[PDB]
């Protein structure tokens, strides 16, 4: 599944709805491995629409339980991420992913 | 057939990425992307075409150089580099 551990609390009231755009910053790394991506480096926040299957399942379920302002460590098992195939060139088969995700804003 | 260059690229990138990442079909991904680039090559003929070419022309031309690099190298890392520039375009259009 996806485990959500809080780094800094959000407001505890404003949670994403299906169909809303979540605006986030993230850093991704392989569990006890390499950092492979960060929107912070790029100075540009990542946006995705919750519930449209644009992103991996662990993000869909993980971000849905976060409130605005929250920063959390998401640990995502391979079956909630890229599974036995991985993501070619970047994520190997059967990788556990850890993301640091900060929910900035909803649009 | 009347369609804005914004639309033809959003739909074309979406479809080409499905063939390549979803289906592992590189031939089908080229087939989709080659006519899109060939229209940029011909040049903008409307104000809306011109402003799309001003904002995204250089990125799309660079994504095409990476794809052409891949044609000659056989190294899939060259095609990923093209998809990073295609996705930045796609997100900006979106």
From Swiss-Prot, chain A:
Q: Membrane topology type, per the record?
A: Peripheral membrane protein
- One annotated GO molecular function: FK506 binding
Has the keyword S-adenosyl-L-methionine been applied to this entry? no
GO cellular component terms, alphabetically, are: cytoplasm; cytoplasmic side of membrane; cytosol; membrane; ryanodine receptor complex; sarcoplasmic reticulum; sarcoplasmic reticulum membrane; terminal cisterna
Family matches, as PROSITE patterns:
FKBP_PPIASE (PS50059)
Q: What class of enzyme is it?
A: isomerase
For this protein, the record's InterPro entries field holds: FKBP-type_PPIase, PPIase_dom_sf, PPIase_FKBP_dom
Reaction(s) catalyzed by this protein?
A: [protein]-peptidylproline (omega=180) = [protein]-peptidylproline (omega=0)
Q: Give UniProt keywords alphabetically.
A: Acetylation, Cytoplasm, Isomerase, Membrane, Rotamase, Sarcoplasmic reticulum
This protein's assembly is summarised as: Interacts with TGFBR1; prevents TGFBR1 phosphorylation by TGFBR2 and stabilizes it in the inactive conformation. Interacts with ACVR1B and SMAD7. Identified in a complex composed of RYR1, PDE4D, PKA, FKBP1A and protein phosphatase 1 (PP1). Interacts directly with RYR2 and RYR3. Interacts with GLMN; rapamycin and FK506 abolish the interaction with GLMN in a dose dependent manner. Interacts directly with RYR1.
Q: Which family does it belong to?
A: Belongs to the FKBP-type PPIase family. FKBP1 subfamily.
Protein name, UniProt field: Peptidyl-prolyl cis-trans isomerase FKBP1A
Q: What is the lineage of its organism?
A: Eukaryota, Metazoa, Chordata, Craniata, Vertebrata
From Swiss-Prot, chain B:
| Tissue expression per record | Expressed in numerous tissues, with highest levels in testis.
Region spans: Sufficient for interaction with the FKBP1A/rapamycin complex: 1-94
Q: What does its PTM field state? A: Autophosphorylates when part of mTORC1 or mTORC2. Phosphorylation in the kinase domain modulates the interactions of MTOR with RPTOR and AKT1S1/PRAS40 and leads to increased intrinsic mTORC1 kinase activity. Ubiquitinated at Lys-48 by the SCF(FBXO22) complex via 'Lys-27'-linked ubiquitination prevents mTORC1 substrate recruitment.
Cross-link named Glycyl lysine isopeptide (Lys-Gly) (interchain with G-Cter in ubiquitin), sites: 48
Q: What is the annotated localization of this protein? A: Lysosome membrane; Endoplasmic reticulum membrane; Golgi apparatus membrane; Cell membrane
Please state what the annotation says regarding this protein's domains. Answer: The kinase domain (PI3K/PI4K) is intrinsically active but has a highly restricted catalytic center.
Task: Tell me how this protein assembles.
Answer: Part of the mechanistic target of rapamycin complex 1 (mTORC1) which contains MTOR, MLST8 and RPTOR. The mTORC1 complex is a 1 Md obligate dimer of two stoichiometric heterotetramers with overall dimensions of 290 A x 210 A x 135 A. It has a rhomboid shape and a central cavity, the dimeric interfaces are formed by interlocking interactions between the two MTOR and the two RPTOR subunits.
Which disease does the record tie it to? Smith-Kingsmore syndrome: An autosomal dominant syndrome characterized by intellectual disability, macrocephaly, seizures, umbilical hernia, and facial dysmorphic features.
What is the protein name stated in its UniProt record?
Serine/threonine-protein kinase mTOR
**What is the organism of origin for this protein?**
Homo sapiens
Q: What gene name is listed for this protein?
A: MTOR
Show which stretch of the intact protein is covered.
2019 to 2112 of 2549
């Amino acid at each position: 599944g996806v485990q959500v551990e809080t780094i800094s609390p959000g407001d505890g009231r404003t949670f994403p709805k299906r169909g809303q755009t979540c605006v986030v910053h993230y850093t991704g790394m392989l569990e006890d491995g390499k950092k492979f991506d960060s929107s912070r480096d790029r100075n540009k926040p990542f946006k995705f629409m919750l519930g449209k299957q644009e992103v991996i399942r662990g993000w869909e379920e993980g971000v849905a339980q976060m409130s605005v302002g929250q920063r959390a460590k998401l640990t995502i098992s391979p079956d909630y991420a890229y599974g036995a195939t991985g993501h070619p060139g970047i994520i190997p088969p059967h990788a556990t992913l850890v993301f640091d995700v900060e929910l900035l804003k909803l649009e | 057939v009347a369609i804005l260059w914004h639309e033809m690229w959003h739909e074309g990138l979406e479809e080409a990425s499905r063939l390549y990442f979803g289906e592992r079909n590189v031939k089908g991904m080229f087939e989709v992307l080659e006519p899109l680039h060939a229209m940029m090559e011909r040049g903008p003929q409307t104000l809306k075409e011109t402003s799309f070419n001003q904002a995204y022309g250089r990125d799309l031309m660079e994504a095409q150089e990476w794809c052409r690099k891949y044609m000659k190298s056989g190294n899939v890392k060259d095609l990923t580099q093209a998809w990073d520039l295609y996705y930045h375009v796609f997100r900006r259009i979106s």
